[PDB]
């Protein structure tokens, strides 16, 4: 939007179409990761 | 025991003229420096040259 370009025009005009909306870590204490599972539409019987 | 000796060298009358602790702590900053260049009232010319030079 036109009125939006005004704000970012002060702090470096660089408004991309896509952003980074990743799941941020909830409040409290963080920790390491154990395992990682990815099921990109497997040929099995998934619901 | 040497550490204890140095912990008493001020009573043996030795030529050691050194200041203890003269620290002054009062955490302060200048948030006004975090303000953009659009707070100094400039012209369109400078408002386009500076921003083009990573300012």
């Amino acid at each position: 939007t036109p009125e939006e370009k005004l704000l970012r025009a002060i702090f470096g005009e660089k408004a991309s179409d896509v952003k980074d909306s990743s799941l941020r870590v909830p409040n409290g204490v963080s920790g390491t990761v154990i395992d990682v599972q990815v099921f990109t539409r497997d040929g099995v019987e998934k619901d | 025991a040497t550490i204890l000796a140095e912990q008493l060298e001020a009573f043996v009358d030795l030529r050691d003229v050194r200041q203890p602790e003269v620290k002054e702590e009062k955490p302060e900053f200048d948030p006004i420096l975090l303000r953009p260049v659009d707070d100094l009232e400039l012209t369109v010319r400078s408002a386009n040259c500076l921003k083009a030079e990573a300012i």
């Binding site: - | 955490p27 302060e28 900053f29 200048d30 948030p31």
Partner: protein
């Protein structure tokens, strides 16, 4: 009947010999959370 307070804290209870009859100890981080609207009122007047 019961109105929730907008500013309240809660934690584990411990002892403190350094405290006096008219004194009470409290967590460090909790101090910033509780007196939030107040701490900002002094930081502006200062240099922080």
């Amino acid at each position: 009947l019961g109105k929730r307070v907008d500013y309240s804290g809660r934690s584990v209870i411990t002892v403190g010999p350094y405290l006096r009859l008219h004194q009470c100890g409290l967590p460090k981080k909790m101090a910033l959370e509780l007196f939030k609207p107040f701490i900002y009122g002094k930081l502006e007047l200062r240099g922080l």
